[PDB]
Amino acid sequence: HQVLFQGFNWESWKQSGGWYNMMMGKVDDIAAAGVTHVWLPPPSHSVSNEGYMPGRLYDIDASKYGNAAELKSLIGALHGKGVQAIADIVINHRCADYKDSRGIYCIFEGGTSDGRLDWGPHMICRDDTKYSDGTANLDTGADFAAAPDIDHLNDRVQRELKEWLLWLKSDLGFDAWRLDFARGYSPEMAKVYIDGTSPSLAVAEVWDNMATGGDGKPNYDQDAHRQNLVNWVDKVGGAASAGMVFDFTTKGILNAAVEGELWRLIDPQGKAPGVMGWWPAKAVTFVDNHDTGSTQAMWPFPSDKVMQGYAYILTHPGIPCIFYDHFFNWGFKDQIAALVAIRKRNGITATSALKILMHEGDAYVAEIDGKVVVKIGPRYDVGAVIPAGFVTSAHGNDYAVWEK
Ligand SMILES: CC1[C@@H](O)[C@H](O)[C@@H](O)[C@@H](N[C@H]2[C@H](O)[C@@H](O)[C@@H](O[C@H]3[C@H](O)[C@@H](O)CO[C@@H]3CO)O[C@@H]2C)[C@@H]1O
Ligand SMILES: CC1[C@@H](O)[C@H](O)[C@@H](O)[C@@H](N[C@H]2[C@H](O)[C@@H](O)[C@@H](O[C@H]3[C@H](O)[C@@H](O)CO[C@@H]3CO)O[C@@H]2C)[C@@H]1O
Ligand SMILES: [Ca+2]
Ligand SMILES: [Ca+2]
Ligand SMILES: [Ca+2]
Ligand SMILES: [Ca+2]
């Protein structure tokens, strides 16, 4: 049984009294809902309030979310309920606190007395010409315009980041990682950190644009998109790695599918159209996150159909991730918990078998492990497609789930 929960949103840094402190009162409900892992925000000092422009990595007390003590208390509370903690790891880029003789901000500060993480321009990708000194390797991935991109091919960088990552586990209690902007560096470099820090899991954010057609909707055939994702997993070590990816393919397709086009939810070979259909053990599914939804709303799930999104991911193969807002702010707590309960009760996991029974525009019906049936869509009656012996267990707006 594995179910993730993103425990923060884009406004979390503003929480009066601190986000971690506030989260202490949410721990019990999260655990009671069947969540096994909670994804927490970047914990270190960051030039940006949300934490995605890290500077002094060891300086946890500088975070807007809370200090080391408050974070250790939250992780301990989670652990007390058998729930693991995932840290949002931002290492593609990093902000340098100090200026060098050239007057450029390329002298870094780890946040400790000694020289740990006290890098210089030699650790900045040579092609990030604004900050580099030209002695480094070329960026192994995409660039982040607002800050220096780190040269992960550098031996000291690899050595010290792994040391820092191990410290996050030993000193704070973190169990796993969420790799931010994984397109910023190669999967071979991500492999270095994953293999070297032994996380229970390492879910990477590998987000590529999804091809669309003349009508502005995504193309039905998204194989190229999920191919990129499976390729990343293969290069990170595949089944021999704790690494996995967020299923952005399923996110993109589902966004469009619920708008009267549920026929998009199956490929020509009868499998799920996203990563879930090719490598479910490595696909972390979701309805929305702090980027796609929340205040940024880069690619929001149709708001009136959010529960259809959860009926889908919480019953299907792959590892589902629940978004904080939908559970504690929107009124879907009970409905979401009921779906996770069905998942757990029936022993459904990431590799459970998926048999799609109907995939028409107004109705999608699927059977999982021959033990659970789920239906989403505006078409009310699908009774004719429900196998004998199944009885309705949970239902809501345009969704229903059956069990035996
Ligand atoms: C479990 C698993 C890994 O062991 C494998 O290394 C992955 O690459 C992926 N393997 C994928 C291919 O990466 C993908 O390209 C497609 O493979 C297709 C080809 O794309 C098509 O051109 C001809 O048929 C093949 C059927 O296997 O589905 C396979 C299941 C699979 O999830
Ligand atoms: C007699 C009967 C069957 O013919 C039907 O196929 C069942 O699924 C069930 N019908 C269920 C819906 O399948 C379920 O989704 C929810 O119905 C939902 C609608 O699906 C939703 O669009 C608006 O809210 C309703 C709640 O009242 O409860 C009903 C009792 C009903 O017992
Ligand atoms: Ca220092
Ligand atoms: Ca940069
Ligand atoms: Ca980003
Ligand atoms: Ca980069």
Coordinates of C-alpha atoms and ligand atoms in Angstrom, one line a residue:
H1 CA 0.0 0.0 0.0
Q2 CA 1.4 3.4 -1.1
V3 CA -0.4 6.7 -1.2
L4 CA 1.4 10.1 -1.3
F5 CA 0.1 13.5 0.0
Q6 CA 1.6 16.9 -0.9
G7 CA 1.5 18.7 2.4
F8 CA 1.8 22.3 1.2
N9 CA 0.7 24.8 -1.4
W10 CA 2.0 28.0 -3.0
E11 CA 0.7 30.1 -0.1
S12 CA 2.0 27.9 2.7
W13 CA 5.1 30.1 3.4
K14 CA 2.7 32.8 4.7
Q15 CA 1.1 30.7 7.4
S16 CA 0.9 32.6 10.7
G17 CA 3.0 30.9 13.3
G18 CA 4.7 28.7 10.7
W19 CA 3.5 26.0 8.3
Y20 CA 5.1 23.1 10.1
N21 CA 3.5 24.1 13.4
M22 CA 0.1 24.4 11.7
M23 CA 0.6 20.9 10.1
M24 CA 1.0 19.3 13.5
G25 CA -2.8 19.5 13.9
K26 CA -3.2 17.8 10.5
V27 CA -1.0 14.8 11.0
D28 CA -3.7 12.6 12.5
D29 CA -6.2 13.1 9.7
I30 CA -3.6 12.4 7.1
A31 CA -2.6 9.2 8.7
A32 CA -6.2 8.1 9.3
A33 CA -6.9 8.6 5.6
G34 CA -4.3 5.9 4.7
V35 CA -1.5 8.2 3.5
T36 CA 1.9 6.6 3.6
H37 CA 4.2 9.5 2.6
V38 CA 3.9 13.2 3.0
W39 CA 5.8 15.5 0.6
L40 CA 7.1 18.6 2.4
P41 CA 8.5 21.8 0.8
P42 CA 12.2 22.9 0.3
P43 CA 13.5 23.2 3.9
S44 CA 16.5 25.4 3.4
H45 CA 17.2 29.1 3.2
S46 CA 15.9 30.4 -0.1
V47 CA 16.1 33.8 -1.8
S48 CA 12.4 33.3 -2.9
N49 CA 9.8 32.8 -0.1
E50 CA 8.5 29.5 -1.4
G51 CA 12.0 27.9 -1.2
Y52 CA 12.8 27.1 -4.8
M53 CA 15.9 29.4 -5.0
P54 CA 18.0 27.7 -2.3
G55 CA 21.2 29.3 -1.0
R56 CA 22.5 28.1 2.4
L57 CA 21.3 24.5 2.2
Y58 CA 22.2 23.7 5.8
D59 CA 20.5 26.8 7.1
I60 CA 17.1 25.3 7.9
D61 CA 16.3 27.9 10.5
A62 CA 16.1 30.5 7.8
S63 CA 13.2 28.9 6.0
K64 CA 9.8 30.7 5.9
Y65 CA 8.1 27.3 6.6
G66 CA 9.7 26.8 10.0
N67 CA 13.0 26.0 11.7
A68 CA 14.9 22.8 12.2
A69 CA 13.1 22.1 15.6
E70 CA 9.6 22.6 14.2
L71 CA 10.4 20.5 11.1
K72 CA 11.9 17.7 13.3
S73 CA 8.8 17.8 15.4
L74 CA 6.5 17.5 12.4
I75 CA 8.5 14.6 10.9
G76 CA 8.5 12.9 14.3
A77 CA 4.7 13.3 14.5
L78 CA 4.3 11.8 11.1
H79 CA 6.7 8.9 11.9
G80 CA 4.6 8.3 15.1
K81 CA 1.7 7.5 12.8
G82 CA 3.7 5.3 10.5
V83 CA 3.8 8.0 7.8
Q84 CA 7.1 8.8 5.9
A85 CA 8.4 12.2 5.0
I86 CA 9.6 13.3 1.5
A87 CA 11.8 16.4 1.2
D88 CA 11.5 18.6 -1.9
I89 CA 15.1 18.6 -3.2
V90 CA 16.1 21.6 -5.3
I91 CA 19.6 21.1 -6.7
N92 CA 19.5 22.1 -10.3
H93 CA 20.4 25.7 -9.3
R94 CA 21.5 27.5 -6.2
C95 CA 21.9 31.2 -5.2
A96 CA 25.4 32.4 -4.1
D97 CA 25.4 34.5 -1.0
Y98 CA 28.7 36.3 -1.7
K99 CA 30.6 38.2 -4.4
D100 CA 34.0 37.2 -5.7
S101 CA 36.9 39.5 -6.8
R102 CA 35.0 40.0 -10.1
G103 CA 32.0 41.4 -8.2
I104 CA 29.8 38.5 -9.3
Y105 CA 27.6 36.5 -6.9
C106 CA 29.3 33.1 -7.3
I107 CA 30.7 32.4 -3.9
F108 CA 28.3 30.1 -2.0
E109 CA 27.6 29.6 1.7
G110 CA 26.5 26.2 3.0
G111 CA 25.3 27.6 6.2
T112 CA 27.8 26.0 8.6
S113 CA 31.1 27.2 10.1
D114 CA 33.4 25.0 7.9
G115 CA 33.6 25.0 4.1
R116 CA 30.8 22.4 3.5
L117 CA 29.0 23.6 0.3
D118 CA 31.1 26.8 0.3
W119 CA 31.6 26.5 -3.5
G120 CA 32.9 29.0 -6.0
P121 CA 32.3 29.7 -9.8
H122 CA 34.2 26.5 -10.6
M123 CA 31.0 24.7 -9.6
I124 CA 28.7 26.7 -11.9
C125 CA 28.0 25.3 -15.4
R126 CA 30.4 27.0 -17.7
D127 CA 27.6 27.8 -20.1
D128 CA 25.8 29.9 -17.4
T129 CA 28.1 32.7 -18.5
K130 CA 26.6 35.3 -16.1
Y131 CA 28.1 33.6 -13.1
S132 CA 30.6 31.0 -14.2
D133 CA 34.4 31.3 -14.5
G134 CA 34.4 29.0 -17.6
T135 CA 36.3 26.2 -15.9
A136 CA 33.2 24.0 -15.2
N137 CA 31.5 21.3 -17.4
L138 CA 28.5 22.2 -19.5
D139 CA 25.1 22.0 -18.0
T140 CA 23.9 18.3 -18.2
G141 CA 20.3 19.6 -18.5
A142 CA 18.1 22.6 -18.9
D143 CA 18.9 26.0 -17.4
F144 CA 17.1 28.0 -14.7
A145 CA 17.3 31.7 -15.7
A146 CA 17.0 33.3 -12.3
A147 CA 20.0 31.6 -10.6
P148 CA 23.4 29.9 -11.2
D149 CA 23.0 26.4 -12.5
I150 CA 25.2 23.8 -10.7
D151 CA 27.7 21.6 -12.4
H152 CA 26.7 18.1 -11.2
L153 CA 29.6 16.5 -13.1
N154 CA 31.9 18.2 -10.5
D155 CA 33.2 15.7 -8.0
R156 CA 33.1 18.0 -5.0
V157 CA 29.5 19.0 -5.8
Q158 CA 28.4 15.3 -5.9
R159 CA 30.3 14.5 -2.8
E160 CA 28.9 17.4 -0.7
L161 CA 25.3 17.3 -1.9
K162 CA 25.2 13.6 -1.0
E163 CA 26.6 14.5 2.4
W164 CA 23.9 17.1 2.8
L165 CA 21.2 14.8 1.6
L166 CA 22.3 12.1 4.1
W167 CA 22.2 14.8 6.8
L168 CA 18.6 15.7 5.9
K169 CA 17.8 12.0 6.8
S170 CA 19.9 11.6 9.9
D171 CA 19.4 15.0 11.5
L172 CA 15.9 15.9 10.3
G173 CA 14.4 12.5 9.8
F174 CA 13.5 12.7 6.0
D175 CA 12.9 9.3 4.3
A176 CA 12.6 10.1 0.6
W177 CA 13.1 12.8 -2.1
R178 CA 11.1 14.7 -4.6
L179 CA 13.5 16.0 -7.3
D180 CA 12.6 19.5 -8.3
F181 CA 13.1 20.5 -12.0
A182 CA 14.7 17.2 -12.9
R183 CA 14.9 18.4 -16.5
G184 CA 17.6 20.7 -15.2
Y185 CA 20.1 17.9 -15.1
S186 CA 20.6 14.4 -16.7
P187 CA 19.0 11.2 -15.2
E188 CA 22.6 9.9 -15.0
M189 CA 23.3 12.7 -12.5
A190 CA 20.1 12.1 -10.6
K191 CA 21.2 8.5 -10.4
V192 CA 24.3 9.6 -8.5
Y193 CA 22.3 11.2 -5.8
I194 CA 19.6 8.5 -5.6
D195 CA 22.0 5.6 -5.5
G196 CA 24.3 7.5 -3.1
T197 CA 21.6 8.4 -0.5
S198 CA 19.3 5.3 -0.4
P199 CA 15.9 7.1 -0.3
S200 CA 12.8 4.9 0.2
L201 CA 11.8 6.5 -3.1
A202 CA 12.8 9.5 -5.3
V203 CA 10.0 10.9 -7.4
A204 CA 11.4 13.3 -10.0
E205 CA 9.5 16.2 -11.6
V206 CA 10.4 15.7 -15.3
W207 CA 7.9 18.1 -17.0
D208 CA 8.0 18.3 -20.8
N209 CA 5.5 20.2 -22.9
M210 CA 2.5 18.1 -24.2
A211 CA 1.8 18.3 -27.9
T212 CA -1.6 19.6 -28.9
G213 CA -3.7 19.7 -32.0
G214 CA -5.5 22.4 -34.1
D215 CA -8.3 22.6 -31.5
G216 CA -5.8 23.3 -28.8
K217 CA -6.4 20.0 -27.0
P218 CA -3.7 17.5 -26.4
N219 CA -3.2 14.8 -29.1
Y220 CA -4.7 11.4 -28.4
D221 CA -1.4 9.7 -29.0
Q222 CA 0.9 10.8 -26.2
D223 CA 3.4 8.0 -26.6
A224 CA 6.3 10.5 -27.3
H225 CA 5.5 12.3 -24.0
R226 CA 5.5 9.1 -21.8
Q227 CA 8.4 7.7 -23.8
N228 CA 10.5 10.6 -22.5
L229 CA 9.4 9.7 -18.9
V230 CA 10.1 6.0 -19.1
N231 CA 13.5 6.8 -20.8
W232 CA 14.4 9.0 -17.8
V233 CA 13.6 6.1 -15.4
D234 CA 15.6 3.6 -17.5
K235 CA 18.6 5.9 -17.4
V236 CA 18.3 6.4 -13.7
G237 CA 18.6 2.6 -13.1
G238 CA 15.1 1.4 -13.8
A239 CA 13.8 -1.4 -11.5
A240 CA 17.2 -1.3 -9.8
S241 CA 16.6 2.3 -8.7
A242 CA 14.4 3.9 -6.1
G243 CA 13.7 6.6 -8.7
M244 CA 10.4 7.2 -10.3
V245 CA 8.5 10.1 -12.1
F246 CA 5.4 12.2 -11.7
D247 CA 3.0 11.0 -14.4
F248 CA 2.5 14.3 -16.2
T249 CA 1.3 12.3 -19.2
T250 CA -1.7 11.1 -17.3
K251 CA -2.2 14.6 -15.8
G252 CA -2.3 16.2 -19.2
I253 CA -4.6 13.6 -20.7
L254 CA -7.0 13.4 -17.7
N255 CA -7.2 17.3 -17.7
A256 CA -8.8 17.0 -21.2
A257 CA -10.5 13.6 -20.9
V258 CA -13.0 14.7 -18.2
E259 CA -14.3 17.4 -20.6
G260 CA -16.6 15.0 -22.4
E261 CA -13.7 13.0 -24.0
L262 CA -13.2 10.0 -21.7
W263 CA -12.3 8.0 -24.8
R264 CA -8.8 9.5 -24.3
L265 CA -8.3 7.2 -21.3
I266 CA -7.1 4.1 -23.2
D267 CA -4.4 3.6 -25.8
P268 CA -4.8 1.4 -29.0
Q269 CA -3.3 -1.6 -27.1
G270 CA -5.9 -1.4 -24.3
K271 CA -3.6 0.1 -21.7
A272 CA -3.8 3.4 -19.7
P273 CA -2.5 6.2 -22.0
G274 CA 0.0 7.7 -19.5
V275 CA 3.1 6.3 -17.8
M276 CA 0.7 4.3 -15.7
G277 CA 0.0 2.1 -18.8
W278 CA 3.7 1.3 -19.5
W279 CA 5.5 1.4 -16.1
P280 CA 2.9 1.7 -13.3
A281 CA 5.4 0.9 -10.6
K282 CA 7.3 4.1 -11.6
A283 CA 4.4 6.4 -12.1
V284 CA 3.2 8.9 -9.4
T285 CA -0.2 10.1 -10.5
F286 CA -1.9 13.4 -9.4
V287 CA -4.8 15.7 -9.9
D288 CA -2.9 18.9 -9.2
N289 CA 0.1 20.3 -7.4
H290 CA 1.4 23.7 -6.3
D291 CA 2.3 24.6 -9.9
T292 CA -0.6 23.2 -11.9
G293 CA -3.1 24.3 -9.4
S294 CA -3.0 26.4 -6.2
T295 CA -2.4 30.1 -6.9
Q296 CA -0.1 29.5 -9.9
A297 CA -2.7 27.6 -11.8
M298 CA -0.4 26.6 -14.7
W299 CA -2.5 23.6 -15.7
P300 CA -5.5 23.3 -13.3
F301 CA -7.8 20.3 -13.3
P302 CA -11.3 21.3 -14.3
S303 CA -12.5 22.5 -10.9
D304 CA -16.0 21.0 -11.2
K305 CA -14.6 17.6 -11.9
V306 CA -11.8 17.2 -9.3
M307 CA -13.5 14.2 -7.6
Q308 CA -13.6 12.4 -11.0
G309 CA -9.8 12.9 -11.0
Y310 CA -9.5 11.3 -7.5
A311 CA -11.9 8.4 -8.3
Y312 CA -9.5 7.7 -11.2
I313 CA -6.1 7.9 -9.5
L314 CA -7.0 6.5 -6.1
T315 CA -8.5 3.3 -7.6
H316 CA -5.9 2.8 -10.4
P317 CA -2.4 1.4 -10.7
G318 CA 0.5 3.8 -10.3
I319 CA 1.1 5.6 -7.0
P320 CA -1.5 8.3 -6.4
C321 CA -0.6 11.7 -4.7
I322 CA -3.3 13.7 -2.9
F323 CA -3.1 17.6 -3.0
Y324 CA -3.4 19.4 0.3
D325 CA -6.1 21.9 -0.7
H326 CA -8.5 19.3 -2.0
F327 CA -8.3 17.4 1.3
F328 CA -8.3 20.1 4.0
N329 CA -9.7 23.3 2.3
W330 CA -12.1 22.0 -0.3
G331 CA -14.8 19.8 1.2
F332 CA -13.5 16.4 -0.2
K333 CA -11.8 15.0 3.0
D334 CA -14.4 12.2 3.6
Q335 CA -14.8 11.4 -0.1
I336 CA -11.0 11.1 -0.6
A337 CA -10.5 9.1 2.6
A338 CA -13.3 6.7 1.5
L339 CA -11.5 6.1 -1.8
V340 CA -8.2 5.4 -0.2
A341 CA -9.9 3.0 2.2
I342 CA -11.3 1.0 -0.8
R343 CA -7.8 1.0 -2.3
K344 CA -6.3 -0.4 0.9
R345 CA -9.0 -2.8 1.8
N346 CA -8.7 -4.5 -1.6
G347 CA -4.9 -4.6 -1.6
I348 CA -4.6 -2.4 -4.6
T349 CA -1.0 -1.3 -5.3
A350 CA 1.1 0.4 -8.0
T351 CA 1.2 -2.7 -10.2
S352 CA -2.4 -3.8 -9.9
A353 CA -4.0 -5.1 -13.1
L354 CA -6.2 -2.7 -15.1
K355 CA -9.1 -3.9 -17.3
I356 CA -11.0 -1.1 -19.0
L357 CA -14.6 -2.0 -19.6
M358 CA -15.9 1.2 -21.2
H359 CA -14.1 4.2 -22.7
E360 CA -16.7 6.4 -24.4
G361 CA -16.8 10.2 -24.3
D362 CA -19.3 10.4 -21.4
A363 CA -18.2 7.3 -19.5
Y364 CA -15.1 5.5 -18.5
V365 CA -15.4 2.2 -16.5
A366 CA -12.5 0.1 -15.3
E367 CA -11.9 -3.0 -13.2
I368 CA -8.8 -3.2 -11.0
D369 CA -7.3 -6.6 -9.9
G370 CA -10.7 -8.1 -10.7
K371 CA -11.8 -6.7 -7.3
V372 CA -12.8 -3.1 -7.7
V373 CA -14.8 -1.3 -10.4
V374 CA -14.8 2.5 -11.0
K375 CA -16.8 4.8 -13.2
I376 CA -16.4 8.4 -14.0
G377 CA -18.3 10.7 -16.5
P378 CA -21.6 12.5 -16.9
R379 CA -23.5 9.4 -18.2
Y380 CA -25.4 8.2 -15.1
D381 CA -26.3 4.6 -16.2
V382 CA -23.5 2.1 -16.7
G383 CA -25.2 -0.8 -14.9
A384 CA -25.1 -3.0 -18.0
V385 CA -21.3 -3.0 -17.9
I386 CA -20.8 -3.7 -14.2
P387 CA -19.8 -7.4 -13.7
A388 CA -22.1 -9.6 -11.5
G389 CA -21.4 -9.6 -7.8
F390 CA -20.3 -5.9 -7.5
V391 CA -22.1 -3.5 -5.2
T392 CA -21.7 0.2 -5.0
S393 CA -19.3 1.2 -2.2
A394 CA -18.7 4.9 -2.8
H395 CA -20.2 7.5 -5.1
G396 CA -20.4 11.2 -5.7
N397 CA -20.7 13.8 -8.5
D398 CA -20.1 11.8 -11.8
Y399 CA -18.2 8.9 -10.2
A400 CA -19.0 5.6 -8.4
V401 CA -16.9 2.7 -7.1
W402 CA -18.0 -0.9 -6.6
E403 CA -16.6 -3.8 -4.5
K404 CA -17.6 -7.3 -3.7
Ligands
LIG1 C1 8.5 -2.0 -17.5 C2 9.3 -1.2 -18.5 C3 10.8 -1.2 -18.5 O1 11.4 -2.5 -18.2 C4 11.3 -0.8 -19.9 O2 12.7 -0.8 -19.9 C5 10.7 0.6 -20.2 O3 11.4 1.2 -21.3 C6 9.2 0.4 -20.7 N1 9.1 -0.3 -21.9 C7 8.1 0.3 -22.8 C8 8.9 1.0 -24.0 O4 9.8 1.9 -23.5 C9 7.9 1.7 -24.9 O5 8.5 2.4 -26.0 C10 6.8 0.7 -25.4 O6 7.4 -0.2 -26.3 C11 6.8 -0.3 -27.6 C12 7.5 0.5 -28.7 O7 7.5 1.9 -28.3 C13 6.7 0.3 -30.0 O8 7.4 1.0 -31.1 C14 6.7 -1.2 -30.4 O9 6.2 -2.0 -29.3 C15 6.8 -1.8 -28.0 C16 6.1 -2.8 -27.0 O10 6.9 -3.2 -26.0 O11 6.2 0.1 -24.3 C17 7.1 -0.7 -23.4 C18 6.3 -1.3 -22.3 C19 8.5 -0.4 -19.6 O12 7.6 0.5 -18.9
LIG2 C1 -30.6 1.2 -9.1 C2 -29.1 1.7 -9.3 C3 -28.4 1.2 -10.6 O1 -29.2 1.2 -11.7 C4 -27.2 2.2 -10.8 O2 -26.5 1.7 -12.0 C5 -26.3 2.2 -9.6 O3 -25.0 2.6 -9.9 C6 -27.0 3.1 -8.5 N1 -27.0 4.5 -8.9 C7 -26.0 5.3 -8.1 C8 -25.1 6.1 -9.0 O4 -24.4 5.2 -9.9 C9 -24.1 6.8 -8.1 O5 -23.2 7.6 -8.9 C10 -24.8 7.8 -7.2 O6 -25.5 8.8 -8.0 C11 -24.9 10.1 -8.1 C12 -24.8 10.5 -9.5 O7 -24.0 9.6 -10.2 C13 -24.1 11.9 -9.6 O8 -24.0 12.3 -11.0 C14 -25.0 12.9 -8.9 O9 -25.2 12.5 -7.5 C15 -25.8 11.2 -7.4 C16 -26.0 11.0 -5.9 O10 -27.4 10.9 -5.5 O11 -25.8 7.1 -6.4 C17 -26.8 6.3 -7.2 C18 -27.7 5.6 -6.2 C19 -28.4 2.6 -8.3 O12 -28.5 2.0 -7.0
CA3 CA 30.5 27.8 5.4
CA4 CA 21.0 29.4 -14.5
CA5 CA 9.5 25.1 -11.5
CA6 CA 20.8 22.8 -15.2

